[PDB]
Amino acid sequence: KLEDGSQYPLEGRLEFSEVSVDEGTGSVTIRAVFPNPNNELLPGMFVHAQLQ
Amino acid sequence: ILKRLFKEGSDVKAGQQLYQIDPATYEADYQSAQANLASTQEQAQRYKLLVADQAVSKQQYADANAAYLQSKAAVEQARINLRYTKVLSPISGRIGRSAVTEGALVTNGQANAMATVQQLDPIYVDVTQPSTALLRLRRELASGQLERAGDNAAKVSLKLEDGSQYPLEGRLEFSEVSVDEGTGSVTIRAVFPNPNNELLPGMFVHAQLQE
Amino acid sequence: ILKRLFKEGSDVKAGQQLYQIDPATYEADYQSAQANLASTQEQAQRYKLLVADQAVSKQQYADANAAYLQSKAAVEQARINLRYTKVLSPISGRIGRSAVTEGALV
Amino acid sequence: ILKRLFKEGSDVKAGQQLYQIDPATYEADYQSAQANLASTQEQAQRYKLLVAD
């Protein structure tokens, strides 16, 4: 779901292998991969991954 | 620097000579390399025929062929250096000021440029906008809500800083050229014809989209 | 930099040439090194035969072999430098602005 | 001997060219000597002034 509140039409995979853990916070970062064939998404966008 | 061949702030063509570095010493190396080559070549040719006839040893032919190869090499380097005495314009555009005065000493690999040329006719207008604004606009190009100007571009107008309209009409191209660090904000470019140089780099302006 | 070769904000491929560094001297060094190699090599090969026959000394052969070894080395470095005059994309992806202009020094 | 230019047994005039010796190396030595003179002459003109100040 994009900053504008809109739904990205494509759908990706949320990968559960941890990329980094935080120092103080101890909170983990993981990553989803989304196809981006029109170059609608660019780095630095604020978004929400939606999980059922 | 023998000469500066251009007027500062003028329009220069791609490949036009902007400076003449004093060629005299470079001409001398070249012509001297060619003289050395003409001689060693004629010998190497003679010896190639002699060694075929066994009128000379392999060594003597070898030595003659070696001298010739050295000469060949020396010519080619000298030719290149001579060519470089004419400092040429890489592009068509408005050249600025010379950082160098006639009679100054220039060095291959010196830290500072001597001049800077700027293609001004087609001119850019850099527009920075939040990632979401751009995504919106791109959709309207495909929706047809925005009028196209060629491939992947919207027709645009320009409003100058004095507040007036620019008479000409440009292209707002949708491939991003940078995304900013702090802000998610994206920079794209419009392209406006500038046939008399009313537009200059550094102006603050407003590109205008009819939706 | 002789040429930039890519549009800013466009897609390039891994391995694609993004810039042309002026190759003229590098080309000349390489051609000349290569021709010198052909010549020191035959000389070293020949002296190798000739020492076995005692028609030249070990010192003469040692010198011929040395000059040949230097030519090999000179050729390899000249080749590598010439190769780098073509600045390639490491990956496929979207390229942004050029931070360096044509005519710039790298 | 690049060329003979005359027919054996024939008549010839004083100053008539009878042979051409290959001039390639001679042409290039001459071109090079002119080039060295130009360069070297300008430098001595230049240094004549320099030493003056």
Curated annotation (Swiss-Prot), chain B:
State where the protein is found.
Cell inner membrane
Segments forming a coiled coil = 24-78
Q: Does the keyword Ion transport apply?
A: no
The GO molecular function terms of this record are:
efflux transmembrane transporter activity; identical protein binding
What domain of life does the UniProt record list for this protein's source?
Bacteria
Family as reported in the entry's similarity comment: Belongs to the membrane fusion protein (MFP) (TC 8.A.1) family.
Task: Please give the name of this protein.
Answer: Multidrug resistance protein MexA
The species this protein was found in = Pseudomonas aeruginosa (strain ATCC 15692 / DSM 22644 / CIP 104116 / JCM 14847 / LMG 12228 / 1C / PRS 101 / PAO1)
Curated annotation (Swiss-Prot), chain D:
- Triggers of expression: By growth under severe iron limitation.
Name the cystine pairs.
none
Q: What happens when the gene is disrupted?
A: Disruption of MexA, MexB and OprM significantly reduces active efflux of N-(3-oxododecanoyl) homoserine lactone/3-oxo-C12-HSL/PAI-1, but not N-butyryl homoserine lactone/C4-HSL/PAI-2.
Q: Where in the cell is it found?
A: Cell inner membrane
Family the entry assigns: Belongs to the membrane fusion protein (MFP) (TC 8.A.1) family.
Q: What does this protein do?
A: The periplasmic linker component of the MexAB-OprM efflux system that confers multidrug resistance. Functions as the major efflux pump for n-hexane and p-xylene efflux. Has been shown in one study to be involved in the active efflux of the autoinducer N-(3-oxododecanoyl) homoserine lactone, thereby playing an indirect role in quorum-sensing; but has been shown in another study not to be involved in efflux of this autoinducer. Over-expression of the pump increases antibiotic and solvent efflux capacities. Implicated in the secretion of the siderophore pyoverdine.
Q: Spell out the subunit comment.
A: Component of the MexAB-OprM multidrug efflux complex, composed of six MexA subunits forming a hexameric tube, binding to a MexB trimer, which interact with the trimeric OprM outer membrane channel protein. OprM is thought to not directly contact MexB; instead, MexA joins MexB and OprM by forming a funnel-like hexamer anchored to the inner membrane. MexA may initially form a hexameric ring complex with MexB prior to OprM, then OprM undergoes a conformational change as it contacts MexA, allowing the periplasmic gate to open.
Reproduce the miscellaneous comment text: In both X-ray crystal structures approximately the last 100 residues are not ordered.
Protein name in the entry: Multidrug resistance protein MexA
Its source organism is: Pseudomonas aeruginosa (strain ATCC 15692 / DSM 22644 / CIP 104116 / JCM 14847 / LMG 12228 / 1C / PRS 101 / PAO1)
Q: Which gene encodes it?
A: mexA
Q: Which section of the whole protein is represented?
A: 74 to 126 of 383
